[PDB]
C-alpha cells in the first residue's frame, strides 16, 4: 500500500500550488483524442500539466479534503482531473471545451471545478 | 543406453526389495530431481527413453544428471522352452530401485521448464513420482 | 474425441464434468473432449 501513498502525496503537492482545473469525463476516451490534448499541453508548457485519472472517491477526494472542497459533488462516475503549475489561466479552460464539441468524449456539460467557489460555466 | 564395461558374474539373483532407500534420498547435485514413491524394476531402455525426452524440450541448458547406473541383469529364458534344464541368459540390465530415491536430477534450468522435464520422465517410469527441490537449512 | 486422460490443449479450453464424465470444451471444435 506504500505505492498508493505516492499516488496521494505527490498530487497534493500540485494542488497546493494549483491555479485552475476542469472536469473531463473518461467515456469513449480514444488515444488519438488524448494526443490532441497532450500536444496542447506542449504549447502551454511541458510535463507540468497532469492527466491522472485516479478518480476513485477513495483516492482523489481525500486529496480534496485539504483544499478544493467542491469535488464531493463531481465525484460520482468517470472523471479526468487536470492540474496547473505555472501558466496564467486562459486557453486551458477553453481548449478542452472545443474538443468535446467536435465529437471525441462527452464533456459532462462541464461540471466545473475550483476557480472561486463555483462550478459550471467555463470562461 | 548405459551398460557396464565388465561384471564379475554373468547372472545374479533377482532379490527382494523392501524398506527405505539405503542412500541418495536427498538431491543436491542438481537444483531439482525426480523422486520415486514406490519401488520397481527399470530396464535400461526405460532410462534412455527418459533422457531423450528431456534433451529435446530443454534445448540449450545444463547437463542432465543420472544418479543411477544399472547393474543387475534380468534373466530371460528363450520362448517355449520347458521349465528347468538350466538358467536362462541376461537379455539386458535393470537397476535396483527403492522408494524415496532420487531417480534423476536437473540443474541450471528455469523453474517453468523444470516442471515439464520431470513430468515427461514420470510417464516413461512406471513408478509414481513427485516434484522435489533442494533444501538449504543449511 | 474420447480418451482416458483428457487434458487442456489451449488456454481457451475449460474443464467441466457432466453426468459423471469430465469434458473439456473449447471455442475450437477439435479441442472438445470427454473421458470415459
Amino acid at each position: 500500500a506504500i505505492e498508493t501513498k505516492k499516488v496521494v502525496v505527490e498530487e497534493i503537492a500540485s494542488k497546493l500550488k494549483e491555479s485552475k482545473s476542469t472536469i473531463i469525463v473518461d467515456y469513449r476516451g480514444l488515444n488519438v483524442s488524448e494526443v490532441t490534448e497532450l500536444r496542447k499541453q506542449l504549447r502551454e508548457a511541458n510535463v507540468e500539466f497532469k492527466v491522472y485519472k485516479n478518480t476513485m472517491t477513495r483516492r482523489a477526494v481525500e486529496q480534496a479534503e485539504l483544499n478544493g472542497l467542491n469535488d464531493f459533488l463531481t465525484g460520482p462516475n468517470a472523471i479526468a482531473f487536470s492540474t496547473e503549475d505555472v501558466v496564467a489561466p486562459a486557453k486551458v479552460l477553453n481548449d478542452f471545451a472545443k474538443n468535446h464539441e467536435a465529437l471525441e468524449i462527452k464533456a459532462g456539460v462541464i461540471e466545473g471545478k475550483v476557480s472561486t467557489v463555483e462550478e459550471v460555466k467555463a470562461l | 543406453m548405459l551398460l557396464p564395461k565388465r561384471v564379475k558374474y554373468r547372472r545374479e539373483h533377482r532379490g527382494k526389495m523392501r524398506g527405505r532407500a539405503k542412500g541418495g534420498t536427498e538431491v543436491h547435485f542438481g537444483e531439482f530431481g525426480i523422486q520415486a514413491l514406490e519401488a520397481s524394476w527399470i530396464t535400461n531402455r526405460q532410462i534412455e527413453a527418459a533422457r531423450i525426452a528431456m534433451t529435446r524440450y530443454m534445448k540449450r541448458g545444463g547437463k542432465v544428471w543420472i544418479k543411477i547406473f544399472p547393474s543387475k541383469p534380468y534373466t530371460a529364458k528363450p520362448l517355449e522352452v520347458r521349465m528347468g534344464s538350466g538358467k536362462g541368459a541376461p537379455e539386458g540390465w535393470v537397476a535396483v530401485v527403492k522408494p524415496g530415491k532420487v531417480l534423476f536430477e536437473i540443474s541450471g534450468v528455469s523453474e517453468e521448464v523444470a516442471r515439464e522435464a520431470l513430468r515427461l520422465a514420470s510417464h516413461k517410469l512406471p513408478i509414481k513420482t513427485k516434484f522435489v527441490k533442494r533444501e538449504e537449512i543449511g | 474425441k474420447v480418451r482416458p486422460s483428457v487434458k487442456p490443449i489451449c488456454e481457451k479450453c475449460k474443464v467441466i464434468r457432466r453426468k459423471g464424465k469430465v469434458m473439456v470444451i473449447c471455442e475450437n471444435p477439435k479441442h472438445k473432449q470427454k473421458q470415459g
Binding site: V35, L38, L42, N46, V47 | - | -
Partner: protein, 133 residues
C-alpha cells in the same frame, strides 16, 4: 485513409498509384500536380504521404521525412551495420552527431522534447549496434 510511398519526383502512372486510390473516388489528375509541388524541395527521395478521405471528395495531404535509421548508416560512415549488434560493435557515433539526426526527424517524430527526441534516436542507433559516444 490509405498511406502510400509515392515518389517525390514522379506521380502519374497507374501501377504505383492508379486504381488503388482511384477506387477511393480520388481525382488523380488534380492531385498529381500537388505531389510535384511541395516535394520538389526534396527531389529524388521516396516521400511517404498520408491520405485522409473526406466524404465530399475533398482531400488534404501530409508529407513525411525519409525513413529512420537510414541516416545512421551515413553518420557511421559504413554502408551496413552488424548482423550481431552489441556482440559486434562495428561502428561508433558521437552524441553531438545524433543531435543533427534527431532534428531532421522532428516533423515525423511525435517526441515532446528535443532531449526526448535524442532518446528516441538512441533506440535506433543501438539497432545498428553502433556505440553512443
Amino acid at each position: 485513409v490509405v498511406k502510400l510511398q509515392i515518389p517525390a519526383g514522379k506521380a502519374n502512372p497507374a501501377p504505383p498509384v492508379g486504381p488503388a486510390l482511384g477506387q477511393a473516388g480520388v481525382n488523380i489528375m488534380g492531385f498529381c500536380k500537388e505531389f510535384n509541388a511541395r516535394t520538389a524541395d526534396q527531389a529524388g527521395l521516396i516521400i511517404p504521404v498520408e491520405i485522409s478521405v473526406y466524404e465530399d471528395r475533398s482531400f488534404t495531404f501530409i508529407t513525411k521525412t525519409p525513413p529512420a535509421a537510414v541516416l545512421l548508416k551515413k553518420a557511421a560512415g559504413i554502408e551496413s551495420g552488424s548482423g550481431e549488434p552489441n556482440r559486434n560493435k562495428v561502428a561508433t557515433v558521437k552524441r553531438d552527431k545524433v543531435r543533427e539526426i534527431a532534428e531532421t526527424k522532428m516533423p515525423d517524430l511525435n517526441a515532446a522534447d528535443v532531449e526526448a527526441a535524442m532518446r528516441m534516436v538512441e533506440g535506433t542507433a543501438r539497432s545498428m549496434g553502433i556505440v553512443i559516444e
